[PDB]
Amino acid sequence: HELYRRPWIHEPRATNFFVRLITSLYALILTIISLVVEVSPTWRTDMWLAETIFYISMYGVGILFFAYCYIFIIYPGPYNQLISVLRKYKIIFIMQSQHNGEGAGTLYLRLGALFFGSVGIVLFGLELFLCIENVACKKVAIAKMIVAIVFTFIQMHFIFCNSKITVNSSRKIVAFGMMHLISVNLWTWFRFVLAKQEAKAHKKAQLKQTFRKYYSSSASRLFALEHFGDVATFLTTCIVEYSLIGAAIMFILWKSIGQNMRIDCSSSSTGLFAGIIFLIGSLVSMGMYTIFESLRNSSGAQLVFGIVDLSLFSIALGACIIGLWRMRHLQYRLHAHGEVIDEILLIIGLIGEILYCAVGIDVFITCRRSADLTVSALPAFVFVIRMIQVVVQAAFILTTSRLRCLSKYSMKYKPGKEIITFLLVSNVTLFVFHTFEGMKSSFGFSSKAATQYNYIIYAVGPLLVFYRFHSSACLAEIWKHTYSTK
Amino acid sequence: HELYRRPWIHEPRATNFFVRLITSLYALILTIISLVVEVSPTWRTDMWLAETIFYISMYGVGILFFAYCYIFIIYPGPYNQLISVLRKYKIIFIMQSQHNGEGAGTLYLRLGALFFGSVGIVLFGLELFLCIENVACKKVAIAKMIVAIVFTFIQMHFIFCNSKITVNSSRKIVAFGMMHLISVNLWTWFRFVLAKQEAKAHKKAQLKQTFRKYYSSSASRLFALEHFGDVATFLTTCIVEYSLIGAAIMFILWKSIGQNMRIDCSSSSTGLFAGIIFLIGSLVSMGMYTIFESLRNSSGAQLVFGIVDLSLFSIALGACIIGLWRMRHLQYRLHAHGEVIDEILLIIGLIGEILYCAVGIDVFITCRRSADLTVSALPAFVFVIRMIQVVVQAAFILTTSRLRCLSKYSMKYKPGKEIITFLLVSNVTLFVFHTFEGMKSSFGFSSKAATQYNYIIYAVGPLLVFYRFHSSACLAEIWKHTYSTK
């Protein structure tokens, strides 16, 4: 006939789309089945053998795909040596390195993946220790923890070294493996957010009892959650953040299938000093709350401590507003210069933060209704300011990540760079502050003043996201890209 | 300096992206807050005034935006007349029609939106009748139902007549309104899927009791759900499907902001006859199960009835397989020729169908464990075949929607057109069959044979999606586009 009149099976675009679609559908089926299995209560108690087989199978297929990659794509050296020996005096195909430079994720994202994977492996090892010291747990728990640790470590190495992967080899096998890795990461994320939700009920009940005794008369489970205090909450949010990052990186790698300067610390001083002041204030607040039992029990102090949190969030929000106003002078990007991975992860962190704040606000009101509204509304104000701050900061981060300093005025004068530096430092301090807040109720709020000024006790919902880490990574990318010479 | 060195506030692309981002964030915040409010148990019981205010506010802002559109964009006639009178002898700006032809959604999608919106308005009117006959309900329920009906009717008209909307007018106002409409539609969808989940617990408990008595010794709530039997389930899935379609249409309209043949029934006979045979078999099965109490109580019959369902799903799956094999000869699309709206809705229906089937399989096993595995595994096989059929059909629909008949052989001979016609007819019959299945447990499974062959009783989970309607719409689009002369 004419050109482009061949069967779609021979068309590279059509068959690439078909493999893409098949792998995506397979992932979707696995993720839905994993969610159904995890929620189901008859799979953790009765069908323990089936649940163990599913767990071992998910991690084992992940490890098999990782081994296939390391042997046949990333490091085909030993395979080439074996194939040469076979040809020498055994039998009578060779692979090539073909190393690439497709760095999918940002360096900050991969470093965070390393840190969170290490913390998750620490959590897995702690479970393993608990199940070793326990007789209730059996040999299958040992295998589950070991295979989880092995998969997590191998995926840490794969994520960090995701540039030397040449996905154009074994395209369909790599697509299926990437989708299985996404399914495994999402299944781990769902497992550990269901585990995090178990502590929500206990915290809620404890809060209701503590509230009542002070205002009266006017299906996944990890043993460390309820054994190692509230540190297990930090470990579990670390592992869910690691799983989210890994799933995003694997999705970027899977999407790439089939598709053919120096630190400029200039104009980063006034913001850096303000960021250091923010860090010093946050650290002083954390230390005063932690080491001084007298301070955490007084009402003056608990008022001042809550005012400190409100001031921190208000200062961050005002910094974002001033940054938008100053950076209004910048220029839009001439062409794309980023991966949607960072935006997607930041939006997921934003969703988690808004959910956390809304649940806290709902619990706060609930509690105030049960006490005839005798509680100061400062915790509600802190929650609302936190939600407004995270929303405005997400908008600011996206807008300024799509901004550049192209004009001569925007080059000699850097509008907002001080604000960007301050926001990056303050986001690191808010990350460590939110880590501390997960252990604030470990001290014990025996202070009646804590029931009327401290807002952490009202946040019984789990914090499933590290929005501050993703915000810091995006802000560092903005700082190093938006204010660059080009 | 040079070109493209102006502030991003003046850059049309940058400010369009900024308005897009702000409206998307606003929608996200509203949807998260709506989900938190609906799940919260203290908003339906204690904070009834706050819940009513939120309900009325969401629907009222939707209606205000709709009125603004109808007055100032779609039908600016009366506004022009008023503005002319003002200029005549009152004061001393005119709007223009600027009607467009941007048909966002498919005709089948808009017709389904009309049908489902009508059914949802019927459900709202039934509630209104119940609350009128009830003294427990107060005047606020009247207002809630009335405003829901008004919003649903206006959005029906807006969705059907979404071509004459010129979104390029009042770009930012229309963006905010489209995002508020998406938030309202998602909030309605979440409300009614939470309502559908309430019947899940009752059905599960009833199934456990009925199973036990036959094998012993070897936060949203709608009053019609538990009052009008299982017809309320059909009405509620109709309203959730309408809300999903409306949200998708509004998203397409919002995405369009800022961006500057005859029926060929040839070669559609053998498939049409097979589709008619499929319809006749399905209707005979439905009638025999409905009108004959003797048949629905016998074991021979209940076995044969389940075998009929298995045969229907197996025939549909085999039709999809044969269609892929035959249409392998077709040609890939030269360029895009569809809106992601249909693909997104089909994938959501697929997710819902897989969730339904997986929950049914989980319940089936659970039940068999409680009876020492004395139940035939036919219901599990039916569920598995249904899930496989829907997955394979989704893959087939997407692949063949990205296919064309460009070669001369693919023109004179139409590969798969018979299969496409048969699949469309059989999907209409499976739609009516799944509608019937929602009323199959209304008869009452007093037949012990129903507890061992009929698989509907094990599907205690709600069917939240009309996957068959979306499949029929996509298949009709394929039939009218893939096998066209061009």
PDB file of N, CA and C in Angstrom, chain A residues 31-59:
ATOM      1  N   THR A  31      -1.011  -4.824  43.140  1.00  0.00           N
ATOM      2  CA  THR A  31      -1.228  -3.861  44.212  1.00  0.00           C
ATOM      3  C   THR A  31      -2.618  -4.012  44.815  1.00  0.00           C
ATOM      4  N   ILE A  32      -3.634  -4.229  43.978  1.00  0.00           N
ATOM      5  CA  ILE A  32      -4.985  -4.413  44.496  1.00  0.00           C
ATOM      6  C   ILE A  32      -5.072  -5.685  45.330  1.00  0.00           C
ATOM      7  N   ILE A  33      -4.471  -6.776  44.849  1.00  0.00           N
ATOM      8  CA  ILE A  33      -4.494  -8.029  45.596  1.00  0.00           C
ATOM      9  C   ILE A  33      -3.738  -7.881  46.910  1.00  0.00           C
ATOM     10  N   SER A  34      -2.610  -7.170  46.889  1.00  0.00           N
ATOM     11  CA  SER A  34      -1.840  -6.938  48.104  1.00  0.00           C
ATOM     12  C   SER A  34      -2.636  -6.129  49.115  1.00  0.00           C
ATOM     13  N   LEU A  35      -3.328  -5.087  48.651  1.00  0.00           N
ATOM     14  CA  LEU A  35      -4.156  -4.291  49.547  1.00  0.00           C
ATOM     15  C   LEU A  35      -5.281  -5.126  50.137  1.00  0.00           C
ATOM     16  N   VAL A  36      -5.901  -5.978  49.319  1.00  0.00           N
ATOM     17  CA  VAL A  36      -6.979  -6.830  49.812  1.00  0.00           C
ATOM     18  C   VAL A  36      -6.452  -7.813  50.848  1.00  0.00           C
ATOM     19  N   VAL A  37      -5.286  -8.404  50.587  1.00  0.00           N
ATOM     20  CA  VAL A  37      -4.707  -9.371  51.514  1.00  0.00           C
ATOM     21  C   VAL A  37      -4.348  -8.701  52.834  1.00  0.00           C
ATOM     22  N   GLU A  38      -3.730  -7.520  52.772  1.00  0.00           N
ATOM     23  CA  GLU A  38      -3.306  -6.844  53.995  1.00  0.00           C
ATOM     24  C   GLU A  38      -4.495  -6.437  54.856  1.00  0.00           C
ATOM     25  N   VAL A  39      -5.550  -5.901  54.238  1.00  0.00           N
ATOM     26  CA  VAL A  39      -6.722  -5.485  54.999  1.00  0.00           C
ATOM     27  C   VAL A  39      -7.458  -6.691  55.570  1.00  0.00           C
ATOM     28  N   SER A  40      -7.471  -7.804  54.846  1.00  0.00           N
ATOM     29  CA  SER A  40      -8.246  -8.965  55.257  1.00  0.00           C
ATOM     30  C   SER A  40      -7.763  -9.484  56.608  1.00  0.00           C
ATOM     31  N   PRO A  41      -8.666  -9.733  57.563  1.00  0.00           N
ATOM     32  CA  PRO A  41      -8.230 -10.228  58.874  1.00  0.00           C
ATOM     33  C   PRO A  41      -8.016 -11.728  58.925  1.00  0.00           C
ATOM     34  N   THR A  42      -8.511 -12.475  57.944  1.00  0.00           N
ATOM     35  CA  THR A  42      -8.382 -13.924  57.927  1.00  0.00           C
ATOM     36  C   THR A  42      -7.105 -14.399  57.251  1.00  0.00           C
ATOM     37  N   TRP A  43      -6.258 -13.482  56.785  1.00  0.00           N
ATOM     38  CA  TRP A  43      -4.984 -13.855  56.188  1.00  0.00           C
ATOM     39  C   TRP A  43      -3.821 -13.764  57.162  1.00  0.00           C
ATOM     40  N   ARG A  44      -3.940 -12.954  58.211  1.00  0.00           N
ATOM     41  CA  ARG A  44      -2.899 -12.863  59.225  1.00  0.00           C
ATOM     42  C   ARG A  44      -3.073 -13.876  60.347  1.00  0.00           C
ATOM     43  N   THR A  45      -4.295 -14.357  60.575  1.00  0.00           N
ATOM     44  CA  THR A  45      -4.575 -15.302  61.651  1.00  0.00           C
ATOM     45  C   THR A  45      -4.700 -16.735  61.144  1.00  0.00           C
ATOM     46  N   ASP A  46      -5.619 -16.979  60.209  1.00  0.00           N
ATOM     47  CA  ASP A  46      -5.887 -18.334  59.737  1.00  0.00           C
ATOM     48  C   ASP A  46      -4.958 -18.733  58.595  1.00  0.00           C
ATOM     49  N   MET A  47      -4.994 -17.986  57.493  1.00  0.00           N
ATOM     50  CA  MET A  47      -4.179 -18.310  56.329  1.00  0.00           C
ATOM     51  C   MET A  47      -2.757 -17.799  56.506  1.00  0.00           C
ATOM     52  N   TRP A  48      -2.116 -18.172  57.615  1.00  0.00           N
ATOM     53  CA  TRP A  48      -0.753 -17.714  57.860  1.00  0.00           C
ATOM     54  C   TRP A  48       0.206 -18.269  56.818  1.00  0.00           C
ATOM     55  N   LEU A  49       0.011 -19.524  56.407  1.00  0.00           N
ATOM     56  CA  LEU A  49       0.878 -20.102  55.385  1.00  0.00           C
ATOM     57  C   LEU A  49       0.720 -19.380  54.054  1.00  0.00           C
ATOM     58  N   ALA A  50      -0.520 -19.077  53.662  1.00  0.00           N
ATOM     59  CA  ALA A  50      -0.742 -18.355  52.414  1.00  0.00           C
ATOM     60  C   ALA A  50      -0.151 -16.953  52.475  1.00  0.00           C
ATOM     61  N   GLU A  51      -0.316 -16.269  53.609  1.00  0.00           N
ATOM     62  CA  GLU A  51       0.251 -14.934  53.755  1.00  0.00           C
ATOM     63  C   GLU A  51       1.771 -14.972  53.686  1.00  0.00           C
ATOM     64  N   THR A  52       2.388 -15.954  54.347  1.00  0.00           N
ATOM     65  CA  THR A  52       3.839 -16.089  54.293  1.00  0.00           C
ATOM     66  C   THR A  52       4.308 -16.383  52.876  1.00  0.00           C
ATOM     67  N   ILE A  53       3.584 -17.242  52.158  1.00  0.00           N
ATOM     68  CA  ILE A  53       3.958 -17.549  50.781  1.00  0.00           C
ATOM     69  C   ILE A  53       3.865 -16.301  49.914  1.00  0.00           C
ATOM     70  N   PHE A  54       2.805 -15.508  50.086  1.00  0.00           N
ATOM     71  CA  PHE A  54       2.665 -14.280  49.304  1.00  0.00           C
ATOM     72  C   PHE A  54       3.782 -13.289  49.616  1.00  0.00           C
ATOM     73  N   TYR A  55       4.102 -13.122  50.899  1.00  0.00           N
ATOM     74  CA  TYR A  55       5.190 -12.240  51.316  1.00  0.00           C
ATOM     75  C   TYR A  55       6.514 -12.667  50.692  1.00  0.00           C
ATOM     76  N   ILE A  56       6.860 -13.943  50.867  1.00  0.00           N
ATOM     77  CA  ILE A  56       8.120 -14.464  50.357  1.00  0.00           C
ATOM     78  C   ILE A  56       8.145 -14.390  48.842  1.00  0.00           C
ATOM     79  N   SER A  57       7.000 -14.604  48.193  1.00  0.00           N
ATOM     80  CA  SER A  57       6.953 -14.559  46.738  1.00  0.00           C
ATOM     81  C   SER A  57       7.176 -13.149  46.215  1.00  0.00           C
ATOM     82  N   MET A  58       6.551 -12.148  46.837  1.00  0.00           N
ATOM     83  CA  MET A  58       6.758 -10.775  46.384  1.00  0.00           C
ATOM     84  C   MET A  58       8.220 -10.372  46.524  1.00  0.00           C
ATOM     85  N   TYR A  59       8.770 -10.551  47.708  1.00  0.00           N
ATOM     86  CA  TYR A  59      10.161 -10.214  47.903  1.00  0.00           C
ATOM     87  C   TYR A  59      11.094 -11.085  47.055  1.00  0.00           C
TER      88      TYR A  59
END
